[PDB]
């Protein structure tokens, strides 16, 4: 997250870190057994880390649970990032508590102009590199479909939305991929892509979770 703030330990209790020896993407806990992330975050050998604040210090509230299954969307296209969504099943259910909690899936899609909370352990620099240890947060508004399409001509599908600030300075970034975009208390987006981070006229692009709720529900009813 570039231009964000330190969230505060465990104040985003549905945020997970995906670890394959190191943190490599975020995700969102949607119930005690299942995490939503980005398909472009797929790796074999994923451990889900819940209850994290500092990802480099064991502070006492974590749960580390291996994935048993990952399910990339059946129509994911890694070239365009259309349908950039994945489900990860935990080997054992998380113990839900004040610091480890699920986020609701949406009933309706979010509205342009809505301010959403984006979070993660990704790079904090637009130019260069610096990865935080503690979880960072950003409030960013959803942009209109037409502004998003103007920013990325020929690249935005109906399964994507843009959020952020066209003047630059505030965005998600590498390492935030797969993490949540929460709007009015619902998981509306997944950190997916963008050209650089926090650059002028290049806002973040997010997977539009409300298009996937029937897939998510049928998949979790069957696995």
Residues annotated as catalytic (active site), given as ranges:
40, 84, 177
Supply the minimum distance, in Å, between the C-beta of residue 56 and Ca ion. 7
Residue 108, annotated as binding a ligand:
no
Supply the minimum distance, in Å, between the C-beta of residue 171 and Ca ion. 25
Coil, strand or helix at 71: strand
Cβ nearer to Ca ion, comparing 51 with 168? 51
Measured CA to CA, the distance from residue 153 to residue 150 in angstroms comes to: 5
Should residue 121 be labelled a site residue for Ca ion when binding is judged by CB under 5 A?
A: no
CA–CA distances in Å: residue 11 to residues 119, 125, 156? 11, 23, 32
Residue 171, annotated as binding a ligand:
yes
Supply the minimum distance, in Å, between the C-beta of residue 58 and Ca ion. 5
Phi, psi of 220 (to 5 degrees): -70, -20
Count of residues near Ca ion by CB under 5 A: 3
Coil, strand or helix at 9: coil
Residue 174, annotated as binding a ligand:
yes
| Contact (CB, 8 A) for 107 and 126 | no
What's the token pair of residue 40?
A: 């472009």
Q: Which residue, among 164, 175, 156, 157, has the nearest Cα to 199 in the 3D structure?
A: 164
Cβ nearer to Ca ion, comparing 121 with 193? 121
Residue 82, annotated as binding a ligand:
no
Half-sphere exposure of 7 (CA within 13 A, CB side): 24
Supply the minimum distance, in Å, between the C-beta of residue 89 and Ca ion. 23
Of residues 150-179, which lie at the interface with Ca ion (CB under 5 A)?
Answer: none
Measured CA to CA, the distance from residue 1 to residue 145 in angstroms comes to: 23
Q: Which stretch binds Ca ion (CB under 5 A): 58-66, 146-154, 161-169, 181-189?
A: 58-66
Of residues 34-53, which lie at the interface with Ca ion (CB under 5 A)?
Answer: 52
Residue 172, annotated as binding a ligand:
yes
Binding-site sequence positions: 52, 54, 57, 62, 171-172, 174-175, 177
Q: In the complex, which residues of this chain contact Ca ion (CB under 5 A)?
A: 52, 54, 59
């Amino acid at each position: 997250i570039v231009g964000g703030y330190t969230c505060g330990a465990n104040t985003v209790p549905y945020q997970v870190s995906l670890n394959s020896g190191y943190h490599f993407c975020g995700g969102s806990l949607i119930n005690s057994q299942w995490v939503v992330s980005a398909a472009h975050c797929y790796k074999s050998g994923i451990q889900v880390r819940l209850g994290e604040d500092n990802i480099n210090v064991v502070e006492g509230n974590e749960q580390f649970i291996s994935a048993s299954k990952s399910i990339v969307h059946p129509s994911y296209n890694s070239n365009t990032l259309n349908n950039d969504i994945m489900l990860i099943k935990l080997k054992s259910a998380a113990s839900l508590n004040s610091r480890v909690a699920s986020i609701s899936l949406p009933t309706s899609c979010a509205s342009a102009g809505t301010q959403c909370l984006i979070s993660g352990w990704g790079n904090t620099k637009s130019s260069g590199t610096s990865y935080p240890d503690v979880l960072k947060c950003l409030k960013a508004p959803i942009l209109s479909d037409s502004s998003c399409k103007s920013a990325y001509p020929g690249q935005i599908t109906s399964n994507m939305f843009c959020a952020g600030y066209l003047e630059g300075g505030k965005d998600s970034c590498q390492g935030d991929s797969g993490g949540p975009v929460v709007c009015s208390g619902k998981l509306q987006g997944i950190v997916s892509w963008g050209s650089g981070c926090a650059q002028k006229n290049k806002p973040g692009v997010y997977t539009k979770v409300c298009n996937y709720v029937s897939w998510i529900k049928q998949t979790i009813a069957s696995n």
